[PDB]
């Protein structure tokens, strides 16, 4: 539906090297467009797509400069929460951040979010009101109190309602030819021998974007969800996505079954068959 700009930070303390590795990736909808890794000396905020390259030197200088200070704050972060949880300095830990903005039909902030996790579990999060925080546990409350006292909320709110939606709009236009044109799935139904002999129908959906899609099987309308195999949607490697669904069918009644495909790149639901 609505477009969105999202940033993902992953900080990992390396008790063996003495510091932390900071990795940050950026996404417009299902497209990664920027990345940062401090693991390499002289790390920069780098482009991931053609359209983000038309940015000036100043844009990269200031993103790099920003994420650098941020990596440092996350390094201190790992050490701080380590203390909150009374954890030894012997193990490695992870501090993740997840924030962004969903642009509504109006072209305004429809949804703003910012959440943090420590060792893969909710730590602290900004509420939908962008005015208050929810702490997952006792330790998180220590931060919640510090952030309320600092009025940290109004700063996240202002970024989400301002720069985040403005950037997103600017990006959607810059990468208009890719971010705003839908790429319908290429489809086909293959037929392979299976156990007990044994015929399995497999419905492929290839090279489509965005990620969201629906693949179902139907014999006479009756859904076949229960005894069908569906795999997680996976990246193609070129920016598009893949997915298939399969079900065993009686050899001789294959055409009784139809594959139903739905995608925002198609004007209408697609009906598919072994032919």
């Amino acid at each position: 539906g609505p477009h969105s700009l999202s940033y993902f930070y992953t900080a990992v303390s390396r008790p063996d090297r003495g510091d932390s590795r900071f990795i940050a990736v950026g996404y417009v909808d299902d497209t990664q467009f920027v990345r940062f890794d401090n693991y390499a000396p002289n790390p920069r905020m780098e482009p991931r797509v053609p359209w983000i390259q038309q940015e000036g030197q100043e844009y990269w200088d200031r993103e790099t400069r920003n994420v650098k200070e941020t990596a440092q704050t996350y390094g201190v972060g790992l050490n701080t929460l380590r203390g909150y949880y009374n954890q030894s300095e012997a193990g490695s830990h992870t501090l993740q951040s997840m924030y962004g903005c969903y642009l509504g039909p109006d072209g305004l902030l429809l949804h703003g979010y910012r959440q943090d996790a420590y060792d893969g579990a909710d730590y602290i999060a900004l509420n939908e009101d962008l005015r208050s925080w929810t702490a997952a546990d006792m330790a998180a409350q220590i931060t919640k109190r510090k952030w309320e006292a600092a009025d940290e909320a109004e700063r996240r709110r202002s970024y989400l309602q301002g720069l985040c939606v403005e950037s997103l709009r600017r990006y959607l236009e810059m990468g208009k030819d890719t971010l705003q044109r839908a790429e319908p799935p290429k489809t086909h139904v293959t037929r392979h021998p299976s156990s007990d002999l044994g015929v399995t129908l497999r419905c492929w959906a290839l090279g489509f974007y965005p990620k969201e899609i629906s693949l179902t099987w139907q014999r006479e309308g009756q859904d076949q969800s229960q005894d069908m195999e569906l795999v997680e949607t996976r990246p193609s490697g070129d920016g598009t996505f893949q997915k298939w669904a399969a079900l065993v069918v009686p050899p001789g009644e294959e055409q009784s079954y139809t594959c139903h495909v739905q995608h925002e790149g198609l004007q209408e639901p697609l009906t598919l068959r072994w032919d």
Binding site: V76, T80, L163
Partner: peptide, 9 residues
Amino acid sequence: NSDTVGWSW
């Protein structure tokens, strides 16, 4: 545009 550096935890 990433969000500016946050507050200390």
